[PDB]
Amino acid sequence: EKGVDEWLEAINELREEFSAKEYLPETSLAPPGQSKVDLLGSKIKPTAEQLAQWE
Amino acid sequence: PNNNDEVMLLQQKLLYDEIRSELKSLSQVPEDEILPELKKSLEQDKLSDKEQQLEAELSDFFRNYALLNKLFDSTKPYPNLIPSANDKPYSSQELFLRQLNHSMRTAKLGATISKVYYPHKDIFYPPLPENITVESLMSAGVHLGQSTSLWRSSTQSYIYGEYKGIHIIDLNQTLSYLKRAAKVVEGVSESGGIILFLGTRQGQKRGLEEAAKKTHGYYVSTRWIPGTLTNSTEISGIWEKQEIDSNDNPTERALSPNETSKQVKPDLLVVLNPTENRNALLEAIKSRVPTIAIIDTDSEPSLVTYPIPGNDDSLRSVNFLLGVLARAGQRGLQNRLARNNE
Amino acid sequence: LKLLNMILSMMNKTNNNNNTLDSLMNKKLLLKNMLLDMNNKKMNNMKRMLNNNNMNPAGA
Amino acid sequence: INNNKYNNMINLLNNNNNNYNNNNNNYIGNINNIYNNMTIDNIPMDILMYKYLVGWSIKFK
Amino acid sequence: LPRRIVPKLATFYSANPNHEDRINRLERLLRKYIKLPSQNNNEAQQTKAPWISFDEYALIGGGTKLKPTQYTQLLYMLNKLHNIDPQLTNDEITSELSQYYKKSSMLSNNIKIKTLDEFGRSIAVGKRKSSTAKVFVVRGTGEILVNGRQLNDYFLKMKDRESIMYPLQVIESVGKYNIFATTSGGGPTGQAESIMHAIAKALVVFNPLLKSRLHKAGVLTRDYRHVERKK
Amino acid sequence: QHYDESLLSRYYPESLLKSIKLAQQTIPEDTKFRVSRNVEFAPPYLDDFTKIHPFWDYKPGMPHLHAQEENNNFSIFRWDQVQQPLPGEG
Ligand SMILES: [Mg+2]
């Protein structure tokens, strides 16, 4: 089952990367090539009918 | 040669944006569309030995780095730039960084500039007192005194002559007085004294702040509070003092309330505009604090210990003389820190 | 097995736009994103718990 | 005192002292940890009010 | 080795040594990063400027010595550093600015997004004088009921009826909703205008983009006037 | 948390163990205590309430609104000194 094989290879590589350093959400789980994203939306997007009425 | 390394990251960065974009797409879909169909598949599916591996590997991987973890703890330049796609044109921020790259390398090609006066260099690259000439003083405008109509005849001995309705200060004497004043600043700095630079004319702050910084001294650019020295306990007692070693590093020792209320008197006062700071000069006299000041043709020489005859109205002349005194202090400070090392 | 099928489904949706980095590179990129969404949930819960106790015992 | 209790809870939460129940209950943990270093020997006498006479006016007529 | 006591701040002999030192620190940053461009969203009037209050800055900026113009000077430099383009900003600037942000992180907001209920109804309450009104707005065809009675029966004055219709007339949705209004207390005018206020607050859920138009018409403002005991 | 009698019997006085046992049989272990933000019943500090403080508690034997002694069983017969001196340093 390559699906379970590649998933189980991806889960253990992640374990090693997080193990290398103290696991902190902001730092360890940052976007690729990013120092860290802070653990800090409900700005609903108007529907096409809502926006048409406003226009 | 190594560009591929960066390309490998960008690939992941692009993939990450794709994963996030479609994570938000599924956040809008109602659960009734996905959940029941998803559960039904599992009801119609049978787990295999391998499938179970991830059934518990992910449970722990999510029960270790998501639930049982510490949410908190008890590219270096411009790291927040959002690069644009290789097909899209440069963003406004990228154009700024693209221009900065040009400014460092190309923008200065073709010629060098010599024998041109740059105002900022008077503050940041002051000359040493021994290298000062009459030409340099004259280039700074130090010789331009006040109108002959405003003459304070007590300055007669500093005057070289009158020209174009103003008195010309004798720069030969200015140089000798400046060298003497500079040596005093160097001595006090090398001895560890408190040097205060006072100047309240518009524009002097920049020169005053740098002079204090390079001599480890103090400055006042806004207003001299009458009584700062004679009534120091009612004005300056509340402000914080600190103990320092011979290297001017804070010892960190907490100070007894007795030591924090005692008057802290300057060892030397430098006044850029003495005609507007009579209060400070009289307090210095009352407090036996030696003083240095630029003495223009309408200014009283005897009110200061070490007068420097010179134009006090031009920022260039003032910053030129202040720069020389500030560097003299710096050399004294460097000689004191050097004798401590060896 | 929603633990697995939901993550497989997520890649299926991304597969729509895709219409083998996806074997190990994308798979990892997804697990990490989920962990950052499960850590923000836990951060929000702490704020609720702290706002429902008496953070200010003596004056406020 | 207010910053000593907030720190106590922040630490008792960051150390984890049912995920579904982790969205309803607000019980932070052991009473001792929440009130660590807050005893009768240092809290009561420091918060008591009206403890110092600072003014007095005596009139006759 | 020999130790001596010296003033802590370079501005010790100034009128307000604490404020001048803080200004100097910000001025250094504005000099070191003079080239960095400023936000072009400033024209878009980004709604972010949570700086500490004058009284809060007086704890760190000289206390009684602190003058209002000195606080104004601090804000002009805090905003200028804050308005540097977010992409091109650095840690140094943000570190310095963090100490001046009003502390509101330990606490959270008390507002939860309003949504239609299980039957598609928007429920809002309004008050005028001594009257109160609870309205149920749902999408419909312009049917209105006041306390179970026809509008013309309950409200005899046409001006009271026109007041109830005004919020729907602003969003041009008079024939798009069914209103079930319940009112109690005060008299006809208080109840009619309390219903008016409650309909306006209930219409914002159907389209939050029309709140600005409702506010501009004046139907979302609670009328404060009440009978005052003569003093 | 519910503790075994052994542990509780090494820290609390015997007279108070029966109350602790009855409370551990009436309050279920899975009780989710809530914090009141209207009425503050407990003090702002932690206290087991096992010892009578000479100052912060009512003086034993003194008459007061919540005195539990009978009116003929008070033990304050001298009134020339302040009954409750200030706590700590004094
Ligand atoms: Mg002059």
PDB file of N, CA and C in Angstrom, chain E residues 172-219:
ATOM      1  N   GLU E 172     -34.436  49.359   0.453  1.00  0.00           N
ATOM      2  CA  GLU E 172     -35.340  49.053  -0.658  1.00  0.00           C
ATOM      3  C   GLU E 172     -35.790  47.594  -0.633  1.00  0.00           C
ATOM      4  N   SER E 173     -36.138  47.105   0.555  1.00  0.00           N
ATOM      5  CA  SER E 173     -36.539  45.717   0.749  1.00  0.00           C
ATOM      6  C   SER E 173     -37.884  45.635   1.456  1.00  0.00           C
ATOM      7  N   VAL E 174     -38.821  46.509   1.084  1.00  0.00           N
ATOM      8  CA  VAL E 174     -40.105  46.547   1.781  1.00  0.00           C
ATOM      9  C   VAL E 174     -40.925  45.298   1.481  1.00  0.00           C
ATOM     10  N   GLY E 175     -40.783  44.735   0.284  1.00  0.00           N
ATOM     11  CA  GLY E 175     -41.551  43.566  -0.099  1.00  0.00           C
ATOM     12  C   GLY E 175     -40.767  42.271  -0.050  1.00  0.00           C
ATOM     13  N   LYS E 176     -39.635  42.267   0.654  1.00  0.00           N
ATOM     14  CA  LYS E 176     -38.749  41.113   0.697  1.00  0.00           C
ATOM     15  C   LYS E 176     -38.706  40.424   2.054  1.00  0.00           C
ATOM     16  N   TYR E 177     -39.452  40.905   3.046  1.00  0.00           N
ATOM     17  CA  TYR E 177     -39.362  40.364   4.394  1.00  0.00           C
ATOM     18  C   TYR E 177     -40.730  40.338   5.056  1.00  0.00           C
ATOM     19  N   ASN E 178     -40.927  39.341   5.914  1.00  0.00           N
ATOM     20  CA  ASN E 178     -42.083  39.265   6.793  1.00  0.00           C
ATOM     21  C   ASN E 178     -41.637  39.617   8.206  1.00  0.00           C
ATOM     22  N   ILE E 179     -42.348  40.546   8.839  1.00  0.00           N
ATOM     23  CA  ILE E 179     -42.010  41.035  10.171  1.00  0.00           C
ATOM     24  C   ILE E 179     -43.092  40.603  11.148  1.00  0.00           C
ATOM     25  N   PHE E 180     -42.678  39.957  12.232  1.00  0.00           N
ATOM     26  CA  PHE E 180     -43.555  39.610  13.345  1.00  0.00           C
ATOM     27  C   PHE E 180     -43.062  40.391  14.559  1.00  0.00           C
ATOM     28  N   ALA E 181     -43.669  41.549  14.798  1.00  0.00           N
ATOM     29  CA  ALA E 181     -43.227  42.473  15.834  1.00  0.00           C
ATOM     30  C   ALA E 181     -44.068  42.308  17.092  1.00  0.00           C
ATOM     31  N   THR E 182     -43.397  42.244  18.238  1.00  0.00           N
ATOM     32  CA  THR E 182     -44.042  42.219  19.545  1.00  0.00           C
ATOM     33  C   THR E 182     -43.514  43.390  20.362  1.00  0.00           C
ATOM     34  N   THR E 183     -44.427  44.194  20.904  1.00  0.00           N
ATOM     35  CA  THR E 183     -44.070  45.433  21.578  1.00  0.00           C
ATOM     36  C   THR E 183     -44.869  45.567  22.867  1.00  0.00           C
ATOM     37  N   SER E 184     -44.262  46.220  23.855  1.00  0.00           N
ATOM     38  CA  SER E 184     -44.905  46.450  25.139  1.00  0.00           C
ATOM     39  C   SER E 184     -44.315  47.701  25.777  1.00  0.00           C
ATOM     40  N   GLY E 185     -45.148  48.414  26.526  1.00  0.00           N
ATOM     41  CA  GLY E 185     -44.712  49.574  27.273  1.00  0.00           C
ATOM     42  C   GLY E 185     -44.781  50.859  26.465  1.00  0.00           C
ATOM     43  N   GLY E 186     -44.829  51.974  27.191  1.00  0.00           N
ATOM     44  CA  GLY E 186     -44.982  53.282  26.590  1.00  0.00           C
ATOM     45  C   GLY E 186     -46.264  53.407  25.789  1.00  0.00           C
ATOM     46  N   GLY E 187     -46.222  54.277  24.784  1.00  0.00           N
ATOM     47  CA  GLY E 187     -47.370  54.540  23.949  1.00  0.00           C
ATOM     48  C   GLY E 187     -47.127  54.211  22.491  1.00  0.00           C
ATOM     49  N   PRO E 188     -48.065  54.604  21.628  1.00  0.00           N
ATOM     50  CA  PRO E 188     -47.926  54.289  20.197  1.00  0.00           C
ATOM     51  C   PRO E 188     -46.624  54.767  19.574  1.00  0.00           C
ATOM     52  N   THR E 189     -46.168  55.973  19.913  1.00  0.00           N
ATOM     53  CA  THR E 189     -44.958  56.504  19.292  1.00  0.00           C
ATOM     54  C   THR E 189     -43.725  55.744  19.760  1.00  0.00           C
ATOM     55  N   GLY E 190     -43.613  55.511  21.067  1.00  0.00           N
ATOM     56  CA  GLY E 190     -42.480  54.759  21.572  1.00  0.00           C
ATOM     57  C   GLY E 190     -42.412  53.359  20.996  1.00  0.00           C
ATOM     58  N   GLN E 191     -43.565  52.703  20.864  1.00  0.00           N
ATOM     59  CA  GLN E 191     -43.585  51.341  20.344  1.00  0.00           C
ATOM     60  C   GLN E 191     -43.264  51.313  18.852  1.00  0.00           C
ATOM     61  N   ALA E 192     -43.834  52.241  18.081  1.00  0.00           N
ATOM     62  CA  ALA E 192     -43.569  52.264  16.646  1.00  0.00           C
ATOM     63  C   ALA E 192     -42.094  52.516  16.360  1.00  0.00           C
ATOM     64  N   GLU E 193     -41.477  53.455  17.079  1.00  0.00           N
ATOM     65  CA  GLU E 193     -40.065  53.744  16.865  1.00  0.00           C
ATOM     66  C   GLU E 193     -39.159  52.690  17.488  1.00  0.00           C
ATOM     67  N   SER E 194     -39.609  52.021  18.550  1.00  0.00           N
ATOM     68  CA  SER E 194     -38.844  50.896  19.075  1.00  0.00           C
ATOM     69  C   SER E 194     -38.841  49.735  18.087  1.00  0.00           C
ATOM     70  N   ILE E 195     -39.964  49.511  17.398  1.00  0.00           N
ATOM     71  CA  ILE E 195     -39.997  48.509  16.338  1.00  0.00           C
ATOM     72  C   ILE E 195     -39.098  48.932  15.183  1.00  0.00           C
ATOM     73  N   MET E 196     -39.141  50.211  14.812  1.00  0.00           N
ATOM     74  CA  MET E 196     -38.256  50.719  13.770  1.00  0.00           C
ATOM     75  C   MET E 196     -36.801  50.414  14.099  1.00  0.00           C
ATOM     76  N   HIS E 197     -36.389  50.707  15.334  1.00  0.00           N
ATOM     77  CA  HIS E 197     -35.007  50.467  15.732  1.00  0.00           C
ATOM     78  C   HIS E 197     -34.673  48.982  15.695  1.00  0.00           C
ATOM     79  N   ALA E 198     -35.617  48.129  16.092  1.00  0.00           N
ATOM     80  CA  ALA E 198     -35.353  46.695  16.132  1.00  0.00           C
ATOM     81  C   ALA E 198     -35.300  46.076  14.739  1.00  0.00           C
ATOM     82  N   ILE E 199     -36.113  46.561  13.799  1.00  0.00           N
ATOM     83  CA  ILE E 199     -36.035  46.057  12.431  1.00  0.00           C
ATOM     84  C   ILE E 199     -34.687  46.401  11.810  1.00  0.00           C
ATOM     85  N   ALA E 200     -34.203  47.624  12.034  1.00  0.00           N
ATOM     86  CA  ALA E 200     -32.916  48.020  11.475  1.00  0.00           C
ATOM     87  C   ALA E 200     -31.795  47.124  11.986  1.00  0.00           C
ATOM     88  N   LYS E 201     -31.827  46.772  13.272  1.00  0.00           N
ATOM     89  CA  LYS E 201     -30.781  45.921  13.827  1.00  0.00           C
ATOM     90  C   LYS E 201     -30.906  44.483  13.340  1.00  0.00           C
ATOM     91  N   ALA E 202     -32.115  44.044  12.998  1.00  0.00           N
ATOM     92  CA  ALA E 202     -32.322  42.685  12.519  1.00  0.00           C
ATOM     93  C   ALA E 202     -32.017  42.529  11.038  1.00  0.00           C
ATOM     94  N   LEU E 203     -32.034  43.621  10.276  1.00  0.00           N
ATOM     95  CA  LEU E 203     -31.763  43.555   8.847  1.00  0.00           C
ATOM     96  C   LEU E 203     -30.281  43.403   8.536  1.00  0.00           C
ATOM     97  N   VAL E 204     -29.401  43.689   9.497  1.00  0.00           N
ATOM     98  CA  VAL E 204     -27.970  43.658   9.219  1.00  0.00           C
ATOM     99  C   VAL E 204     -27.482  42.226   9.045  1.00  0.00           C
ATOM    100  N   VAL E 205     -28.179  41.254   9.636  1.00  0.00           N
ATOM    101  CA  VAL E 205     -27.757  39.864   9.503  1.00  0.00           C
ATOM    102  C   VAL E 205     -27.946  39.377   8.074  1.00  0.00           C
ATOM    103  N   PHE E 206     -28.992  39.842   7.390  1.00  0.00           N
ATOM    104  CA  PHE E 206     -29.253  39.371   6.035  1.00  0.00           C
ATOM    105  C   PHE E 206     -28.208  39.878   5.051  1.00  0.00           C
ATOM    106  N   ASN E 207     -27.653  41.059   5.294  1.00  0.00           N
ATOM    107  CA  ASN E 207     -26.604  41.602   4.446  1.00  0.00           C
ATOM    108  C   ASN E 207     -25.765  42.589   5.249  1.00  0.00           C
ATOM    109  N   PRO E 208     -24.662  42.147   5.862  1.00  0.00           N
ATOM    110  CA  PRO E 208     -23.864  43.065   6.688  1.00  0.00           C
ATOM    111  C   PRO E 208     -23.228  44.203   5.909  1.00  0.00           C
ATOM    112  N   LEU E 209     -23.277  44.181   4.578  1.00  0.00           N
ATOM    113  CA  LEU E 209     -22.736  45.273   3.781  1.00  0.00           C
ATOM    114  C   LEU E 209     -23.613  46.515   3.812  1.00  0.00           C
ATOM    115  N   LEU E 210     -24.854  46.401   4.280  1.00  0.00           N
ATOM    116  CA  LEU E 210     -25.784  47.519   4.325  1.00  0.00           C
ATOM    117  C   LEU E 210     -25.817  48.202   5.685  1.00  0.00           C
ATOM    118  N   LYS E 211     -24.962  47.786   6.621  1.00  0.00           N
ATOM    119  CA  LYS E 211     -24.955  48.414   7.937  1.00  0.00           C
ATOM    120  C   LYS E 211     -24.598  49.892   7.834  1.00  0.00           C
ATOM    121  N   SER E 212     -23.643  50.233   6.967  1.00  0.00           N
ATOM    122  CA  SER E 212     -23.224  51.624   6.838  1.00  0.00           C
ATOM    123  C   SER E 212     -24.370  52.502   6.354  1.00  0.00           C
ATOM    124  N   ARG E 213     -25.180  51.996   5.423  1.00  0.00           N
ATOM    125  CA  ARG E 213     -26.326  52.765   4.954  1.00  0.00           C
ATOM    126  C   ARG E 213     -27.386  52.891   6.039  1.00  0.00           C
ATOM    127  N   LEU E 214     -27.577  51.844   6.842  1.00  0.00           N
ATOM    128  CA  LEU E 214     -28.537  51.923   7.937  1.00  0.00           C
ATOM    129  C   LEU E 214     -28.073  52.909   9.000  1.00  0.00           C
ATOM    130  N   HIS E 215     -26.781  52.890   9.330  1.00  0.00           N
ATOM    131  CA  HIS E 215     -26.252  53.852  10.290  1.00  0.00           C
ATOM    132  C   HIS E 215     -26.400  55.276   9.771  1.00  0.00           C
ATOM    133  N   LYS E 216     -26.129  55.487   8.482  1.00  0.00           N
ATOM    134  CA  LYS E 216     -26.213  56.828   7.916  1.00  0.00           C
ATOM    135  C   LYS E 216     -27.642  57.355   7.928  1.00  0.00           C
ATOM    136  N   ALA E 217     -28.631  56.477   7.748  1.00  0.00           N
ATOM    137  CA  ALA E 217     -30.023  56.903   7.802  1.00  0.00           C
ATOM    138  C   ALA E 217     -30.469  57.226   9.221  1.00  0.00           C
ATOM    139  N   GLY E 218     -29.754  56.731  10.228  1.00  0.00           N
ATOM    140  CA  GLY E 218     -30.049  57.040  11.609  1.00  0.00           C
ATOM    141  C   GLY E 218     -30.954  56.056  12.311  1.00  0.00           C
ATOM    142  N   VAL E 219     -31.192  54.879  11.727  1.00  0.00           N
ATOM    143  CA  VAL E 219     -32.120  53.915  12.316  1.00  0.00           C
ATOM    144  C   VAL E 219     -31.434  52.944  13.265  1.00  0.00           C
TER     145      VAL E 219
END
